[PDB]
Amino acid sequence: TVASISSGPKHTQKVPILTANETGATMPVLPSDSIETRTTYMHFNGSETDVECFLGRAACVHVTEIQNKDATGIDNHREAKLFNDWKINLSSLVQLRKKLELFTYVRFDSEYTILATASQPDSANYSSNLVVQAMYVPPGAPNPKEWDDYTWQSASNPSVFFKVGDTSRFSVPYVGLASAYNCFYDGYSHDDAETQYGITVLAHMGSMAFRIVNEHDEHKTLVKIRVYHRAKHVEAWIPRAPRALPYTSIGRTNYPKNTEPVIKKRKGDIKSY
Amino acid sequence: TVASISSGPKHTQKVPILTANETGATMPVLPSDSIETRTTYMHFNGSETDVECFLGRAACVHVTEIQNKDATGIDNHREAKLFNDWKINLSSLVQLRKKLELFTYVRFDSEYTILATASQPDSANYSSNLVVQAMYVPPGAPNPKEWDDYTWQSASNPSVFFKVGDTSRFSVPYVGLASAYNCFYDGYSHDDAETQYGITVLAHMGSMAFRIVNEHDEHKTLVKIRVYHRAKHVEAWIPRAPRALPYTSIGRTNYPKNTEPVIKKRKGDIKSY
Amino acid sequence: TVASISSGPKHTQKVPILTANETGATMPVLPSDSIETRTTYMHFNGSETDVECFLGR
Amino acid sequence: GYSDRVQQITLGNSTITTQEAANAVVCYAEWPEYLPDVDASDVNKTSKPDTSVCRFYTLDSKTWTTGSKGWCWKLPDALKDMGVFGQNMFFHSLGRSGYTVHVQCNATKFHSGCLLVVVIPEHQLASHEGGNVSVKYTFTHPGERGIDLSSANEVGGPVKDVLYNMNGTLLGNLLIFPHQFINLRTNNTATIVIPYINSVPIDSMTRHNNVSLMVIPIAPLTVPTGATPSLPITVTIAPMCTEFSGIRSKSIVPQ
Amino acid sequence: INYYKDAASTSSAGQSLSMDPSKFTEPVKDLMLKGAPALN
Amino acid sequence: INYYKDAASTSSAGQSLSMDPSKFTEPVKDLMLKGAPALN
Amino acid sequence: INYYKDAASTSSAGQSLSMDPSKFTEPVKDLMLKGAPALN
Amino acid sequence: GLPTTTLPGSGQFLTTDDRQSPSALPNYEPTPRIHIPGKVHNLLEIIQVDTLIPMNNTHTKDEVNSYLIPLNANRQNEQVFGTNLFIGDGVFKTTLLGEIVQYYTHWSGSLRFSLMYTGPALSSAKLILAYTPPGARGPQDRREAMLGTHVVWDIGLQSTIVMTIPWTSGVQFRYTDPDTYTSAGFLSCWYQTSLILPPETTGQVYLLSFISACPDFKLRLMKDTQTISQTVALTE
Amino acid sequence: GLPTTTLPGSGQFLTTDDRQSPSALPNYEPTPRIHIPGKVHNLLEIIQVDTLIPMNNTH
Amino acid sequence: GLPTTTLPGSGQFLTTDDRQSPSALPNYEPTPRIHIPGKVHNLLEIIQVDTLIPMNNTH
Ligand SMILES: Cc1cc(CCCCCOc2ccc(C3=NCCO3)cc2)on1
Ligand SMILES: Cc1cc(CCCCCOc2ccc(C3=NCCO3)cc2)on1
Q1: Kind and range of the H or E element at H143?
Q2: In Å, what is the CA distance from B18 to each residue of B10, B96, G39?
Q3: Which Cys pairs does UniProt list as disulfide-bonded (chain C)?
Q4: J5 vs chain F: nearest CA distance in angstroms?
Q5: Is there a contact between A251 and A199 (Cβ–Cβ < 8 Å)?
Q6: Are residues H93 and H158 in contact, defined by beta-carbon separation less than 8 angstroms?
Q7: Contact at 8 Å (CB) between J28 and A48?
Q8: Chain H residues close to B191, C-beta within 8 Å
């Protein structure tokens, strides 16, 4: 492939460099339209800018935490982090978010990796070996109430059991209801006067719930869960302007008030170098 | 292959052993040009002197250390070794360095092995199990500031998570900007009067950053990281004189003052055996 | 596979929507027996409702 | 003698002529088309009023003055009250449509000024409150009036800050969306053909707007000496290939 | 070799090697030739 | 590839792709045609 | 068998078995024959 | 039982590796795809669309005005604007090009810089745009500027001028984050003759300026952008 | 000895995965199947049989 | 699931072994090679060039 062809002096009536940008086109002008060039080859394919590659590496999408401790006398397991859940979503952590929102609709399979590490902040004789049981709880399924409810039987709901310190990995097909996931949605769930506006209405994909299977030892053990997400088989439509201001909320476009100028001011003139 | 052919008495006008070294050549003289020889075969190929073999074994290129401890009240994580980094470079440890600098330009893929072991120098009930997360931070990427910054999300930056005591291994293609890496560079980054001189200007490949993912236990744990590097797919050009004096700096050729004579003095005469 | 065929106005002596449930049958009535439909395809096989799948986790 | 410059668009019972055009943009290089069966889901036969809905409606005019910040209309909202297009809209459960948008602004060879005319698929607005305040319905359904970016923040309304496109992105990058400029010195109209863009084959026309049309002054209007300091901008829009499905009782929407 | 039955479980996809910027860079209705006048 | 000798040790079965609701939806002795009168 | 997609991930290269010292040992412009006088 | 040996790296999680995994939802059937205009395949497809450069960066809070380069009637010989070409920083940084370049470590290729004139139709002007390849200082006067890559632009019916910064380089890749060795030059613009307004007209006229990449362009070695960060996880 | 590398997920138990296992009862012979009317293959077969709706829910 | 047995040496790191590894930079394209005079393939090539001997070591 040639990156530049050889081109010499020109004295024409045919001027490729004068255009009318009002038309909305970006005319494909090249170095050889306005200087004299020599042949050179590309030596490159643009492999690593493919959208599959761009969205295809694992990104941290969520960090939560649960603890193993005596539940005796706990009136609210959920509240003691005896188990915890996560209202699945991919917009909470914002590094991966800016990348996805370069597109309007996106379609992909997900590969999740879940790393779990334990901490024992206060005096323990040892490190126990805990098994985590993260289970997927889709919309309209008995949400779990204690850390050892019938829910955890999970007879119809996919669940994975792995050890703290290890990693769990599995992959979920594209579960969207439509043909693509909306990265943006300028609508409502119905024409009410006070119903929420955004995608949050849209992208209610149910939540994920984690717990330790082990009963309690004499000390307490903090287990912190990190969920990583990798898109595989990516398809993206309609590019948009990149995010400039900071994010404030999952699912709304809102930016913070009295934010700071995002364009760097010159130290000098327009004329400055 | 014959290592020596059979050759007998000679009384010629054709003298292969008289030459003129002023020409710059090393004339290919053999035993059979000046004594009577018998046939012998080589029985050998020179396999283990191939440059791929010479530069192809893992060498320790870096030892760093980070600790897991309560960051509560630490004003400078980087400074507490709450995480640490490494300004990637291959010239810091000097065993592998002398080997590479036998050549001027070198091109290869790298295979890294990272061994991490833990130490608990002061009273602990136990040994905790920590997961390290070494992540590659290339030039012009948000350098991380705390041990748990948004940076560690590493949504676009390759990162590996492995356990202390284990080893991590992965391989990075030849990332040089030019066609080869310069082992030497007699230039500057621009024609300023005070800009640094060497390769240090050249070979600024960004740094690598390590941290423990675990929160803190009651005791403190020292984790010491050793990075090993193995060249694979090696290509080397222009041999040079081997390094004689000791090294003083990454990237400059400078040797120490009042160094010692590097040539061993005879215990005796020129005539001595 | 078609999920619905195209069907238009009807003025018949042949009424598929009147039945006698006392018989014990569930007559296979479709949208196109009582409204005007357009063609659409199924795009689906019913894979995940197989009893092997239902009892297989 | 055809110029890129003169054009005629006849759609239904209405025709537009421009003698000073700058080509026309067809979003994503695709022209509006009806919904194919292979893409269909709802089993209902759809209704295609054709020429009674696919004609040109001219919205009420705006006034560009030196202080203008820009205006924003949403589709199909802007047309919610135009003739039979609008009736069909409130009466069917689902509908789908593409449009031809023609923005008009003429001046003289002594004026200067340049407007950006852009179509943004799925323009989800931001609340000026920050945090996770929502933008109430009424605020994102201004109707033919559209939203006036130089009007004041209101409560439950969107933010109207132009350097941020009403969503946290910079004005400068709106050029990645199908758009055309109106530069008084060149141009006097902008025309964009919009194909139907959605993640579902057909949708509700009232709970979801699928494009915002935005006209933004970028090089300020500068009139000749002692000229009146303002120009009107007119927007005429025509639904094209419209289809409605799931007819019934007639939606009732807030406010 | 896929070891698993479902398609979601396969590795990353392989490069589009599609690449056609004209839907974004030249969505004009009447074709513009480089070198010919923009507005006739 | 089965690595094991016994049939019980193989993985899940594969979709019936049988599907015939008539034993449940139309177990009538004399065949009913849709469109013809139910009771003659 | 490569298990990985990228070339960097393959094992070490295999012996040049190239070997030609003359660029280093005899870079003279006019060819010198062993046995003939060095300087004529 | 087949004998195996495990190698160094066993059990590691590398966020960039690409392997198979069990599906959690065996046998599930995804929604059919329908057609949607606009599919993107390569980021290289989109960085060829031009977007506006806030060249007039001299303000103090972001404003529509930093997109406008002003022009003065009747000045002769003088300089319209100047900038270095660190596409990952400074004016370029918020543009779509700048914004994508920042996801990669290295770039190579030609850039296309165009200027669209917005002054009254009855005015006229001749400007010179100059590209100065690495190695010299930003030009200080047109004489200096005109000795490097330049285009005399004659403002006419055809409203925009497209200047190309042809890839001039020793090393075949440059860093996107500004680096010296790797630096790309300067871009300046001066009056060639001068802007002239018709009667009954007055004041400043402005140029809009765009940037996009030529088909020439290469970007490699993905990394994280300095353009976005956060201090606590967001919630709904 | 063939060189291997284990990936993330090793040792996990996913209740939905489908793999082979050793039989605890090697060589055992199950009872023959006889014919039984009524076999169900898909839940889609049975949701087409109609059942009564307690529409008058007001009690 | 295929039955395996691990041998002595599993998990060891031998600095001299030569195996495959995942690439951290999937799909990256290295700079083209250009021609450079002087390529060395074997250390045996270079030890045939003669160099001076500090024979007079007596200093
Ligand atoms: C955009 C966008 C991204 C998302 C997330 C979609 C992923 C589908 C549901 O995700 C899961 C997560 C976990 C599990 C799980 N099963 C057993 C353990 O974890 C299953 C599906 O939604 N919209
Ligand atoms: C000579 C010479 C040698 C070098 C080093 C080059 C290696 C390229 C960059 O090295 C790395 C190191 C680590 C990682 C990494 N990714 C995830 C974890 O570690 C990636 C590239 O530079 N010049």
Answers
A1: helix H142-146
A2: 15, 40, 10
A3: none
A4: 14
A5: yes
A6: no
A7: yes
A8: 135
Total residues found in chain C within this entry: 57
User: Could you give the dihedral angle defined by the CA atoms of residues D154, D158, D164 and D167, in that order, rounded to the nearest 10 degrees?
Assistant: 160
Provide the 8-state DSSP code for B203: -
- Would strands H2-6 and I2-4 be described as parallel, antiparallel, or unpaired? parallel
Cβ of residue A203 lying under 6 Å from some atom of ligand 1: yes
What are phi and psi for residue A119, nearest 5 degrees? -130, 145
When the candidates are 2.60.120.20, 3.40.50.2020, 2.40.50.100, 3.40.50.200, the CATH number that belongs to H1-236 is 2.60.120.20
Which pair of tokens denotes residue H77?
A: 């010989």
Closest CA to B170 of A229, I9, H11: H11
Please give, rounded to a whole number of angstroms, the shortest distance from the CA of J27 to a CA of chain B: 9
Structure tokens at I17: 């995965």
Distance B111 CA to ligand 2 centre (A): 9
CATH architecture of D1-255: Sandwich (2.60)
SS3 D145: helix
Tell how far CA E9 is from the center of its chain: 25
Q: Which two tokens stand for residue D10?
A: 């006849």
Question: How far are the Cα atoms of B94, B102, B264, D14 from residue B243, in angstroms, in the given order?
Answer: 11, 8, 16, 87
In what helix (H) or strand (E) does residue A94 lie, and over which residues does it extend?
helix A94-100
How many angstroms separate the Cα of D100 from the Cα of each of A68, B229, D27, D170? 62, 62, 10, 26
Q: What is the rounded distance in angstroms from the CA atom of residue J10 to the CA atom of residue H77?
A: 76
Domains in chain G, number: 1
Structure determination method: X-ray
J32 and chain A in contact, CB less than 8 A: yes
H176 touches chain B (CB under 8 A): yes
Q: Which amino acid is at D81?
A: D
| Cβ–Cβ < 8 Å for D43, C37 | yes
| Resolution value, angstrom units | 2.9
Going from the Cα of A136 to the center of ligand 1, the distance in angstroms, rounded, reads 8
Domains for chain A: give ranges and CATH numbers: 1-273 (2.60.120.20)
Task: Return the ∠ at Cα A205 (arms to A203 and A206), rounded to 5°.
Answer: 135
Determine the structural domain holding residue E3 and report its residue range: 1-40
Whose CA is closest to A107, among A189, A177, A158, A187?
A177
**Which atom of ligand 1 has the smallest separation from the CA of A110?**
7
Residue B244 has a CB neighbour count (10 Å cut-off) of 10
Q: Do J19 and I3 touch (CB under 8 A)?
A: yes
For ligand 2, residues with CB inside 6 Å are B 88, 90, 110, 112, 134, 136, 158-160, 172, 175, 181, 203, 205, 208; J 24
Q: Which amino acid type is present at position A80?
A: A
Distance CA H132, CA D213 (A): 40
Residue A150 backbone dihedrals phi, psi, to 5 degrees = -70, -30
Cβ neighbours of G27 (radius 10 Å): 13
* Chain-centre distance for alpha carbon B127: 33
Number of H helices, E strands in chain C: 1, 2
Domain CATH for E5: 4.10.80.10
Q: Taking CB atoms and an 8 Å cutoff, what residues of chain A touch E15?
A: 45, 47, 50, 52-53
| Six token digits for residue B233 | 């797919």
Nearest chain A alpha carbon to E8: A173
D65 forms beta bridges with D230
The rounded distance, in Å, linking the Cα atoms of H22 and A12 is 64
